[PDB]
Amino acid sequence: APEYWCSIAYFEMDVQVGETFKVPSSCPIVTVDGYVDPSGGDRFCLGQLSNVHRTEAIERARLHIGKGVQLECKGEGDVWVRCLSDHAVFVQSYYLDREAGRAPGDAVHKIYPSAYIKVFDLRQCHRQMQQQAATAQAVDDLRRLCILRMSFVKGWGPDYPRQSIKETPCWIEIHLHRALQLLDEVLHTM
Amino acid sequence: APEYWCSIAYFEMDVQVGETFKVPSSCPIVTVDGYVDPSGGDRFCLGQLSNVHRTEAIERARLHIGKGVQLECKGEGDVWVRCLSDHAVFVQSYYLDREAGRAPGDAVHKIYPSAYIKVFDLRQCHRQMQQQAATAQAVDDLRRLCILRMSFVKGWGPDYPRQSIKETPCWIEIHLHRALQLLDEVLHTM
Amino acid sequence: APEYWCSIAYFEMDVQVGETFKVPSSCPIVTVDGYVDPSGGDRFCLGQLSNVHRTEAIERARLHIGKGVQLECKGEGDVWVRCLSDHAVFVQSYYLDREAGRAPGDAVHKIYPSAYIKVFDLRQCHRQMQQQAATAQAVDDLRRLCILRMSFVKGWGPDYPRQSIKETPCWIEIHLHRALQLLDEVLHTM
């Protein structure tokens, strides 16, 4: 159904750097690292990208993204993250929120090196959007359910010196295409 | 001749949001709405796009783009707009300027809900660019003749609190490819 | 090996304008000019691009890019520049630095009208990255070796009123794909 199972935008603080990477449905697994190969098919390298506003602090952090992470889509649209770098990663995920009994969105999840964790569930997502839309009928919030965000080196949130992800030196925002298609359908039945 | 009959860039105030959408010549009609399907072929959805600088005022306005508009290319490059939302749209068009006896560029045209209006004429455009180039010979101005701009919710101009389109919360700039090809030819005969 | 032998980003001061142009390996020669054809395959036109932050000074300079330059890839990845405009061009190239006995990066090279000069050598590049990486083992610097930058009208550097290229009204940054692939390999053997 989707041409690309996802599209990824990389940011350094509140600036988007480089262009959006679109992962074909033919690449179930995509790696995002600090390397430099621009060929980009099933691997999105952040090391060769320029940013005229880059600071030494951002360059310092980019040094630590190393092997980065692998994003894997299982089935129609279930998503898993595998932390390949030797530095912990920080993920914003509604699925992980629920699985931690944390209030929706009110949590940043630290994924340790070598960790292979599931970060999104399609069906759960579909159920939640229908219920959430239905309750609304009795889109900016609903779309966030189909998006994952990940900071590569600095954690953000309450117990950190950083209030928001846009305050981290290097992060990505992942748009789940199949999830968004379902949301589009839902929105039309409203 | 053109691969894409047009390319569209969406803005929120003076910031371009999302990437440029390119409409294949195979899609004579393209819809631009406030929905969220990212599949984008003959439909450019603005609802799923993020903007780290977005304000509540911009989110309020995006709420009103709804079904948006349809841009249709008739023949080689004649363009028509159909207002699908239940909110009026505001178009900058040299063709509409001439048809309103308004000074070139000195007008913003309000297109009401359900309205199906012609906003660009290829041949007129071709005639005007030749005459205008010829007079110049006796490119920033000439290219504007091949561009349409449209604000989705707020009108701008003299009788409005907004001086320019870049002051509106959500708008698009449409580049007419065939028109630009003709302009390129003209410029080489100068 | 590479799908695109290079990708080019255009800037006006410190703002990237338009999207990145990707040159297929099928187009050994690509022309970058001040014209307006958006078809862009083996020719990247800067004249039809908009920039809401553009100043009259930038428009004045864009007026002088005219026929611009041709970038040619000879063999696997040797690069030559041909100055087609009647205005001199200003290139940042490590290859040209070495050939001028200038300290790496500490030079801006003026290429005069009609000049057809070689600005990059693949093998030299490969040798330098290996040596440079090896010395480091005893990536932001290494990647610059695979990048060419060119200001179209204003020269920058010590003997000019402009300290950096991001201070020029119109310039491009060219990423050499094959060179970057070699660098990626090198980095993995570290």
From Swiss-Prot, chains A, B, C:
Consequence of substituting K166R: Abolishes ubiquitination
Q: How is it modified after translation?
A: Phosphorylated by PDPK1. Monoubiquitinated on Lys-166 by E3 ubiquitin-protein ligase TRIM33. Monoubiquitination hampers its ability to form a stable complex with activated SMAD2/3 resulting in inhibition of TGF-beta/BMP signaling cascade. Deubiquitination by USP9X restores its competence to mediate TGF-beta signaling.
> Mutating D33N: what's the consequence?
In a colorectal cancer sample; somatic mutation
Q: Where in the cell is it found?
A: Cytoplasm; Nucleus
Query: N6-acetyllysine modification sites?
Result: K110, K154
* Residues annotated as site: Necessary for heterotrimerization: R162
Name all MH2 domain ranges: 5-190
Q: What is the effect of changing R162S?
A: Reduced heterotrimerization
Location of the Glycyl lysine isopeptide (Lys-Gly) (interchain with G-Cter in ubiquitin) covalent cross-link?
K166
Q: Which domain of life is it from?
A: Eukaryota
Q: What is the effect of changing R98S?
A: No effect on heterotrimerization. Partially diminished transcriptional activation
Give the family, as the similarity comment puts it. Belongs to the dwarfin/SMAD family.
Disease implicated: Pancreatic cancer: A malignant neoplasm of the pancreas. Tumors can arise from both the exocrine and endocrine portions of the pancreas, but 95% of them develop from the exocrine portion, including the ductal epithelium, acinar cells, connective tissue, and lymphatic tissue. Juvenile polyposis syndrome: Autosomal dominant gastrointestinal hamartomatous polyposis syndrome in which patients are at risk for developing gastrointestinal cancers. The lesions are typified by a smooth histological appearance, predominant stroma, cystic spaces and lack of a smooth muscle core. Multiple juvenile polyps usually occur in a number of Mendelian disorders. Sometimes, these polyps occur without associated features as in JPS; here, polyps tend to occur in the large bowel and are associated with an increased risk of colon and other gastrointestinal cancers.
Q: What does this protein do?
A: In muscle physiology, plays a central role in the balance between atrophy and hypertrophy. When recruited by MSTN, promotes atrophy response via phosphorylated SMAD2/4. MSTN decrease causes SMAD4 release and subsequent recruitment by the BMP pathway to promote hypertrophy via phosphorylated SMAD1/5/8. Acts synergistically with SMAD1 and YY1 in bone morphogenetic protein (BMP)-mediated cardiac-specific gene expression. Binds to SMAD binding elements (SBEs) (5'-GTCT/AGAC-3') within BMP response element (BMPRE) of cardiac activating regions.
| Name of the protein in its database record | Mothers against decapentaplegic homolog 4
